[PDB]
Amino acid sequence: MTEYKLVVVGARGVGKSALTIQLIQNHFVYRKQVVIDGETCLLDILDTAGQEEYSAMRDQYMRTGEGFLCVFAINNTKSFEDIHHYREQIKRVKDSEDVPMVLVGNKCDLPSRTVDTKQAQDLARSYGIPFIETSAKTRQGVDDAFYTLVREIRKHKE
Amino acid sequence: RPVLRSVNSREPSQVIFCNRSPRVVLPVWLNFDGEPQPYPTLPPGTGRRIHSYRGHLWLFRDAGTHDGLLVNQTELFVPSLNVDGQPIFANITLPVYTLKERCLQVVRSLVKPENYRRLDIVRSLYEDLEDHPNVQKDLERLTQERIA
Amino acid sequence: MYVKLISSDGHEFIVKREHALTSGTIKAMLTNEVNFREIPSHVLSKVCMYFTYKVRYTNSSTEIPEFPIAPEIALELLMAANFLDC
Amino acid sequence: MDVFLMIRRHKTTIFTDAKESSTVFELKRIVEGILKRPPDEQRLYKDDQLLDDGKTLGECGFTSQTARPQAPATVGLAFRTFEALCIEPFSSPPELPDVMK
Numbered sequence: 226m227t228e229y230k231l232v233v234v235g236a237r238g239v240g241k242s243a244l245t246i247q248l249i250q251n252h253f254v255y256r257k258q259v260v261i262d263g264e265t266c267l268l269d270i271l272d273t274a275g276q277e278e279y280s281a282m283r284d285q286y287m288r289t290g291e292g293f294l295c296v297f298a299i300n301n302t303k304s305f306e307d308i309h310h311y312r313e314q315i316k317r318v319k320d321s322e323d324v325p326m327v328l329v330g331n332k333c334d335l336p337s338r339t340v341d342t343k344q345a346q347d348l349a350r351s352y353g354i355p356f357i358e359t360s361a362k363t364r365q366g367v368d369d370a371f372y373t374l375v376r377e378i379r380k381h382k383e
Numbered sequence: 384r385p386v387l388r389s390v391n392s393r394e395p396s397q398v399i400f401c402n403r404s405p406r407v408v409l410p411v412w413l414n415f416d417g418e419p420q421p422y423p424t425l426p427p428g429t430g431r432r433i434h435s436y437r438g439h440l441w442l443f444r445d446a447g448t449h450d451g452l453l454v455n456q457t458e459l460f461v462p463s464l465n466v467d468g469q470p471i472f473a474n475i476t477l478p479v480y481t482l483k484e485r486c487l488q489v490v491r492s493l494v495k496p497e498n499y500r501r502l503d504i505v506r507s508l509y510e511d512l513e514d515h516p517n518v519q520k521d522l523e524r525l526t527q528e529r530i531a
Numbered sequence: 532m533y534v535k536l537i538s539s540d541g542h543e544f545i546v547k548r549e550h551a552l553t554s555g556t557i558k559a560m561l562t563n564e565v566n567f568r569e570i571p572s573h574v575l576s577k578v579c580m581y582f583t584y585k586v587r588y589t590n591s592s593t594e595i596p597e598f599p600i601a602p603e604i605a606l607e608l609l610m611a612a613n614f615l616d617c
Numbered sequence: 618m619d620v621f622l623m624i625r626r627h628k629t630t631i632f633t634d635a636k637e638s639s640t641v642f643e644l645k646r647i648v649e650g651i652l653k654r655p656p657d658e659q660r661l662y663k664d665d666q667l668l669d670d671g672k673t674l675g676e677c678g679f680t681s682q683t684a685r686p687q688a689p690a691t692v693g694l695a696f697r698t699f700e701a702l703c704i705e706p707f708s709s710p711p712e713l714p715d716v717m718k
């Protein structure tokens with residue numbers, strides 16, 4: 226049985242922990258044995274934290290992850306602009322340029338959308354990674370989001 | 384504070400790393416205290432768009448041997464601020480090594496460090512061989528050399 | 532302007548004076564003729580190949596190729612380079 | 618495109634450059650300024666084939682990728698009746714040390 230170490234990163238307040246809680250407990254106020262494409266595998270979701278710390282100890286913890294979920298809230302334009310900074314820090318620690326990655330637009334159950342889905346789709350095509358719109362409250366796209374990253378780690382590892 | 388160190392300008396400037404050397408380039412960034420930090424390597428003939436900041440220092444070495452490399456026909460690279468968004472280019476090349484230093488690289492790449500003193504060369508070349516290049520000894524030279 | 536460089540086995544190499552001045556040892560010696568009693572012909576020719584390589588590629592501003600050194604020549608070439616200061 | 622050559626005869630070897638579009642007769646004129654011998658008493662060869670005074674060095678087999686500065690090509694020279702092309706060979710390096718294998 227192959228294990229997958231996934232990491233959820235993003236701006237402060239985008240829903241990193243909420244997505245992880247709902248993915249595991251089906252609850253909205255970390256390991257899960259999942260069958261993806263007929264393959265039994267375990268999802269080891271790492272701490273989401275979010276505090277800014279540029280130490281070698283933090284780099285060592287993030288370097289262990291194989292796939293990264295870059296999250297932004299569709300109602301917060303700043304969380305979308307920060308996606309570039311989060312993606313570059315991921316490439317720096319992983320020592321690679323094509324890291325298994327999936328862009329995630331969280332909080333799509335909200336009526337104050339300030340980021341067009343086409344803007345994220347255009348950004349996703351530029352980075353060569355898939356994009357998925359999710360909602361931790363409604364569990365919309367939450368399973369589609371994490372599974373899609375799992376498909377990227379396998380395709381990356383071939 | 385060390386003279387050779389980066390400034391916390393926090394102003395981003397897009398840089399293009401171009402490796403036109405037959406070596407695997409190790410981009411080394413001097414932090415805000417003069418301590419070198421390694422970064423992802425560039426295979427030969429490869430180019431990568433880099434996110435950096437104004438006033439930050441960069442140097443380039445061979446990823447495996449830590450030989451010296453040239454950026455823009457110079458050893459140190461400082462990007463300015465992007466003029467109207469135009470990114471700044473960093474063209475990594477091989478330096479025209481001295482025939483002595485070039486021979487040292489070839490001998491080091493063929494003999495284990497334990498068997499250096501087993502070669503039919505003069506006793507001085509043993510010390511020259513085991514004086515492997517590093518960033519620390521070079522940083523001391525570029526520090527004292529930048530005085531005006 | 533050329534100079535003559537004679538090896539230990541009697542091979543005379545005619546290189547441009549600017550190219551020969553690349554080494555400090557030859558610069559101190561020069562007249563128009565220099566002899567090396569301890570440098571064989573196959574090693575002195577390679578040094579002249581470095582001379583032509585160094586003068587041509589010092590002014591290049593985009594990319595430089597690697598200077599090839601065979602394993603069978605490296606040790607002899609290293610001692611000659613150390614003696615020539617180049 | 619520049620070509621880099623080793624004009625060799627007996628125990629003499631000249632390190633010089635030229636243009637791939639330059640003439641063999643022009644190269645003989647370069648040997649004239651170095652060894653003080655006219656082109657009428659010179660015969661330039663590529664290996665064992667005589668080079669005509671009208672063809673270009675490229676048309677003889679000396680291109681930019683065959684005559685790099687770090688690996689120049691070899692041109693034979695014979696002086697005057699002409700003599701047989703004789704190029705004395707360079708020395709040989711010793712047996713590669715057991716350590717470098």
Ligand SMILES: Nc1nc2c(ncn2[C@@H]2O[C@H](COP(=O)(O)OP(=O)(O)CP(=O)(O)O)[C@@H](O)[C@H]2O)c(=O)[nH]1
Binds near residue numbers: 237239276333334
């Ligand atoms: N409506 C809605 N609210 C959400 C969603 N995801 C998270 N939230 C809300 O956003 C807030 C932050 O959620 P949380 O998961 O803690 O965010 P985070 O990115 O982990 C914040 P930090 O980085 O500081 O730990 C909470 O008030 C939570 O209820 C979502 O999909 N929909």
Ligand SMILES: [Mg+2]
Binds near residue numbers: 241242273274275
């Ligand atoms: Mg959290």
